């Protein structure tokens, strides 16, 4: 799948999930390299540090 699954995910409470895309990368100059990389885009919930610092 083009994204990671959240079918059995329990929410964090201090970090918010935004996007979890995955991509398959190849190196044109190597030809023996391959990997799958997932970007975890996470958004902080700022109330705690707002209250405690700002």
């Amino acid at each position: 799948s083009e994204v990671a699954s959240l079918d059995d995910f329990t929410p964090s409470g201090e970090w918010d999930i935004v996007a979890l895309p995955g991509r398959r990368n190849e190196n044109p100059d190597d030809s023996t390299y391959v990997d799958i990389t997932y970007d975890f885009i996470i958004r902080r919930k700022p109330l705690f540090y707002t209250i405690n610092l700002i």
Partner: antibody
Amino acid sequence: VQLQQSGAEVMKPGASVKISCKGTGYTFSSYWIEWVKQRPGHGLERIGEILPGSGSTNYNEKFRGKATFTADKSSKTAYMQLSSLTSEDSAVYYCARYLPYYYAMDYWGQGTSVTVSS
Amino acid sequence: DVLMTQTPLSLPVSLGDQASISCRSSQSIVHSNGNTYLEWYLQKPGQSPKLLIYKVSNRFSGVPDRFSGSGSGTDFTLKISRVEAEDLGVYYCFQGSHVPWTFGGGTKLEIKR
């Protein structure tokens, strides 16, 4: 992939609505569902979005309190709840699939028509 | 919320004429990663909106090549080179950069004769 919305609805002012968008053919839990309102006059207005995988939800300024989103993990469907209804809410509501900062709104629902009158 | 403004509210242009739609934002909508997330949609009457362009420099798959976008942090423009009857509808801006994401005001397109 297919996004399936509920059928049209007619109800009196002051009632509450619960329209649903059901998606199939992709990882439902990992996409933001964007709810868009289109008054018959003109203009597309975005009510908010929900991420079925978690409870995350965002509402536009004009719709806070007016609308409320909910999702079911087991059944690939998400619900929008409308608070005390009025004649101004008479419009057609859309559901779309969105992944922020990457490919965007490539699939939409058919559209649900909600009309309010006595 | 970021406010997106589209002009002109109408653009009657005969077939084969270049059509340009302007889009302006209350704030800059450039993102930290180096990209700016602006999307263009087309809603024909009686149909749901259709995606046309995203990350304006880019373009969606399946749409014809006559479409193209460009712009800086606050000013963006969509361009249609050679119009037809299948390009009739309402074009909307959509900024995906700053939460909450908001739509443009829309701009009806007509053909002048």
